[PDB]
Amino acid sequence: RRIVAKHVTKTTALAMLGTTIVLVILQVLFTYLGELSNLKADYSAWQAFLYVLWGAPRYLYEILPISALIGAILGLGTLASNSELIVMRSVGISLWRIVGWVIRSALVLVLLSFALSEWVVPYTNERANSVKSHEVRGYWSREGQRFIYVDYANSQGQLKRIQVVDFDDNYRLKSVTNAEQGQFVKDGQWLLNHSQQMAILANAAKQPFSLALQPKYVHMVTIDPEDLSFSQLVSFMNYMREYSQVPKTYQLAFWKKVASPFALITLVLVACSFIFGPLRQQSMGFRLVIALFIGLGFYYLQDFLGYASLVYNPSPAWFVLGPIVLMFVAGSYLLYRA
Amino acid sequence: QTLCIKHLAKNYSKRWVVKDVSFEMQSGQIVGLLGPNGAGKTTSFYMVVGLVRMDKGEIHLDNLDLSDLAMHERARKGIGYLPQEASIFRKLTIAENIMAILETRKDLNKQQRQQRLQELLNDFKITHIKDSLGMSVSGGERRRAEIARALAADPKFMLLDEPFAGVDPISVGDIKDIIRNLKDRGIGVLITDHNVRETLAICEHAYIVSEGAVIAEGSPQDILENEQVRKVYLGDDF
Amino acid sequence: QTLCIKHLAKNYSKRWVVKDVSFEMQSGQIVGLLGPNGAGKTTSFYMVVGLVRMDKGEIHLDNLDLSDLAMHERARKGIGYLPQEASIFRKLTIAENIMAILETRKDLNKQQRQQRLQELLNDFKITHIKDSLGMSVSGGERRRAEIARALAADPKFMLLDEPFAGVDPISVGDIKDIIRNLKDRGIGVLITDHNVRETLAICEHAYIVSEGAVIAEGSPQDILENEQVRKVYLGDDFT
Amino acid sequence: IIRRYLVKQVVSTSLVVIALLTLIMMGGRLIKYFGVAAQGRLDAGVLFSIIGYRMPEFLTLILPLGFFIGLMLVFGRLYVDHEMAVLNGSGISRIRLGQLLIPLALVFLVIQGILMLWMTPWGLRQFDQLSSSQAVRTGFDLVRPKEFISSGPYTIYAGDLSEDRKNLKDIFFYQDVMILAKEATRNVVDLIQGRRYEIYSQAEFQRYRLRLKVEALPSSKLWNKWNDPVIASEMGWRVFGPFTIVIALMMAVALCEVSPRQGRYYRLIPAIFIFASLIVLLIAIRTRISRDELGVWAYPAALAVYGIAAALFSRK
Ligand SMILES: CN1C(=O)[C@H](CCCCN)NC(=O)[C@H](CCCN)NCc2cccnc2Sc2c(Cl)ccc(-c3ccc(N)nc3)c2CNC(=O)[C@@H]1Cc1c[nH]c2ccccc12
Ligand SMILES: CCCCCCCCCCCCO[C@@H]1O[C@H](CO)[C@@H](O[C@H]2O[C@H](CO)[C@@H](O)[C@H](O)[C@H]2O)[C@H](O)[C@H]1O
Secondary structure (H helix, E strand, O other), X not given: OOHHHHHHHHXXXXXXXXXXXXXXXXXXXXXXXXXXXXOOOOOOHHHHHHHHHOOHHHHHHHHHHHHHHHHHHHHHHHHHHOOXXXXXXXXXXXXXXXXXXXXXXXXXXXXXXXXXXXXXXXXXXXXHHHHHHOOEEEEEEEEOOEEEEEEEEEOOOEEEEEEEEEOOOOOOOOOEEEOOEEEEEEOOEEXXXXXXXXXXXXXXXXXXXXOOOOHHHHHHOOOOOOOOOHHHHHHHHXXXXXXXXXXXXXXXXXXXXXXXHHHHHHHHHHHHHHHHOOOOOOOHHHHHXXXXXXXXXXXXXXXXHHHHOOOOOOOHHHHXXXXXXXXXXXXHHHHHOO | OEEEEEEEEEEEOOEEEEEEEEEEEEOOOEEEEEOOOOOXXXXXXXXXXXXXXXXXXXXXXXXXXXXXXXXXXXXXXOEEEEOOOOOOOOOOEHHHHHHHHHXXXXXXXXXXXXXXXXXXXXXXXXXXXOOOEHHHOOHHHHHHHHHHHHHHOOOOEEEEEOOOOOOOOOOHHHHHHHHHHHHHOOOEEEEEOOOHHHHHHHOOEEEEEEOOEEEEEEXXXXXXXXXXXXXXXXXXOO | OEEEEEEXXXXXXXXXXXXXXXXXXXXXXXXXXXXXXXXXXXXXXHHHHOOOOOOEEEEEEOOOEOOOOOHHHHHOOOEEEXXXXXXXXXXXXXXXXXXXXXXXXXXXXXXXXHHHHHHHHHHOOOHHHOOOEOOOOOHHHHHHHHHHHHHHOOOOEEEEEOOOOOOOHHXXXXXXXXXXXXXXXXXXXXXXXXXXXXXXXXXOEEEEEEOOEEEEEEOHHHHHHOHHHHHHOOOOOOO | OXXXXXXXXXXXXXXXXXXXXXXXXXXXXXXXXXXXXXXXXXXOOOHHHHHHHOHHHHHHHHXXXXXHHXXXXXXXXXXXXXXXXXXXXXXXXXXXXXXXXXXXXXXXXXXXXXXXXXXXXXXXXXXXXXXXXXXXXXXXXXXXXXXXXXEOOEEEEEEEOOOOOOOEEEEEEEXXXXXXXXEEEOOOEXXXXXXXXEOOEEEEEEEEEEOOOHHHOOHHHHXXXXXOHHHXXXXXXXXXXXXXXXXXXXXXXXXXXXXXXXXXXXXXXXXXXXXXXHHHHHHHHHHHHHHOOOOOOHHHHHHHHHHHHHHHXXXX
């Protein structure tokens, strides 16, 4: 079967893309209103429009889960209200096959979500921040049993006022070394000057020693764990895990990204099951209203359970994959009830 | 082929709308499922199709239990459904509507699918609109394309829902000719309709269901001369 | 009183659904506005009620133009509407359904409003079910409450939309008595209905609206003998 | 009977919408507040008091929005299930039905007049004192597990943290005095099995104790002093603000006509944006007067333009 599949996929795809265009345009206009109250002498209305316009790919990335939900509601709602889903079942097309055709439309949004996350959002985020405001300072890091503090760190391999403190398995001091400038030449060693090193008293004009800081991840320190792309996040987590402990705010960000495609498909399946179930024979406006309540309910639930994973002992995987598994099970049950 | 249906039952808001509705239908035979409005003729009809889940009952088709099957699992066994409302694929052409369901057939290859599509269009005289969108055709022309589309799935029992709905007396003969054509094609037809004057004119064996149960059975001649049907449904004069 | 309708017209999506429809209905006379489905009999009926805005023509009630008046302004002139679908106030008591419209009347005080409600309930044999909600009644009893409610507004012309819709042959005769009673009440009745066989059995003057224009006019006997109607609407075999 | 029928319907569905918007508008803020509390920047035990003190602030917006939405759902239902064809067909127009709800809108105007004039400042006054009390948190209060927190001259690293923000584990403290402890219970912090270093003085120990708006002013004080544009914008926002209920009445009557097949909720999203364009205009008017660019007379003018536009559209 191909003609039926194209009709169901194209109708839903145009509804998922049509909702995406509308939702991004509304969020750009709404964000611009909030950004219009921060104008000043050096930040004009045009400067505040580019900062919001450059943020559109990031608003786009966060709309795809809710535009796919509304898209499947409106895409299949048009088919359902026209009695087109009844005559697909009347010839032998199952409910799970019609859901599979809608998932094909959502798989375009999942691939679009990957492209924005990996290559588009991390770039326009850099451009957006440069529009408004126009290397990490006071960087505190731990490397196993050593605590390293650098006042100024640069992505090109420059340091200012380094301070490294060594400890034992019994937590006893060995050396508190301080420098004035530092340079990066190879992994696991940095060249530096004026090595005023304590010993449990010593000095050196120029000597390198071992430290695991790398300039590649310096620019990722200030970036929030949520904002980091998956390529940046996993590489950064692998770097921290090799020398220290990864914070739970990075574990949550990792799980909130690996479960992003699975929350888009699951939320589509819930939309399809509602069309065949509770939202059958309802008005198009009522389906859109309910599709907005599920979107907010899912956004609030994933926001709250994200925060709850940073305050409670269990791993963030339980809180992130919790609703996704339950909505899939509950959504697949509403499909079993036909 | 015989579609045995035994002891149907269904409740809504803790009220049994259908109570022990049982009737038998054979292939190549028109059977009218009639009765007072809201007395269970529509609900008993939908439980045969599969829209309404069966609380109690047994549906058999050639020693083959369709009771547990869903709407689509029955449709693959040879049960068709023609909705009363407009059910044409709006954005697909009339030829694409029939071709959409013809590709579902497994025992047809691409060579004979086009031949089957051509004769289905010629049978119902919708060739002149084969390239027009399903949303831009006349109600009489669209309904012929919905029946032609339903016949693309090769059904053994076509369950028509309200065929004489909004049909003028001039074109009531056209619908009867279509329904008579389905019988001559070897397809049993189950008709539920509010228009009982014309449904009792093509059906060979009618079932009158009142108060949720079958109160009469037989040919339209026997239905008319039935005291319970005359008292409850048809009235003294008819 | 004579409701006069002249040269109705209405175009939908640049297609003239109604083209020069004109008919006259008097008080105490039942007029059936019939015709092929989708030929403009439904749209022409709505322009008389006021649901759809007129696009050409005029409506008169004893040299009192009603074309420019909205639906509610014609109702105060004595024109009623009975929707085919369930139009009862769902969460109001049946006694309150009739009473909600009786309190609208200005020429009735509390003393004679309860008297009118009591006789309206008795005239339609719903006084036994007068304490139940509008949405918790039988289909036959609900319509009797919608006609009692309509009479509470004291109309001079009642425009019935599909009175014989979803009605069993046992209960078709019950509606015939209701419509006959409305005529016996001095109220003209305009009926549009797909069930032409039963609509022609009560109306004394039927109008057949085909291709957007009135093609027939007169008693049901004259409509049946019309060769133009039997070619487009009724067919060769009809009685 | 027809007025009591409508008031019961509008009040019932407006309270549902108001309770539905309160759960959504402040459920989102409560979750956001919980996000701040999860990072130690706000006490987890007071974030329910913040929601209590922001009830009048959000209900200032929800009440006109709940009344507007509840009005169109009721008037949409009358159109959808043909109760308006028999009300118009009996001589009662839609404008007449909206005029039967003026006594109800006056009650909602009085209710919101209480919110805008009294509880919105009172709620914001207590919230401002409370929020400023949470901005002084520093030191071990802002600590996070497996992370370095710097607050002034203090740098604190904790290897683990309980579900409550007590009983720290693997504590590192830096000024220059460096303190490392295995356990710490909480500024007053009791350190257990720790080492103290001075940067060269070393002192091991078993236990250690470480000791490291015009929007809320009362309306009484704002009744006078109309000369100042900042007070002029705020006091005008409190006096002409409650009259959005009346505008939400005659604009919900205008934008409620909907077909039975279209649905009760068909005209919600298109018409919530028409209502929201009024509020966005009124927020854009409150700021200009605050900079002394527009004048206080523009509050009724914004309402009158929407009032006249709604009245003209309902009578077309
Ligand atoms: C800067 N403002 C605030 O501080 C209010 C105060 C919150 C309620 C306090 N009780 N918060 C916010 O903006 C937070 C984000 C800020 C995070 N700190 N969320 C958004 C928001 C909420 C509430 C109202 N509008 C808005 S967004 C807005 C809108 Cl919808 C429409 C127009 C404008 C605007 C006006 C003039 C101008 N040239 N460009 C733009 C804005 C910008 N917003 C503003 O101008 C307002 C002005 C204002 C001060 N007191 C008010 C009391 C009621 C209504 C408005 C105000
Ligand atoms: C259903 C909707 C009906 C129509 C509603 C139209 C109005 C919608 C509300 C507009 C809300 C504006 O939302 C507002 O977005 C701005 C972004 O500029 C956020 O602003 C926040 O982040 C920006 C940059 O990210 C900072 O410059 C700013 O200082 C900070 O407050 C506000 O915290 C938020 O309140």
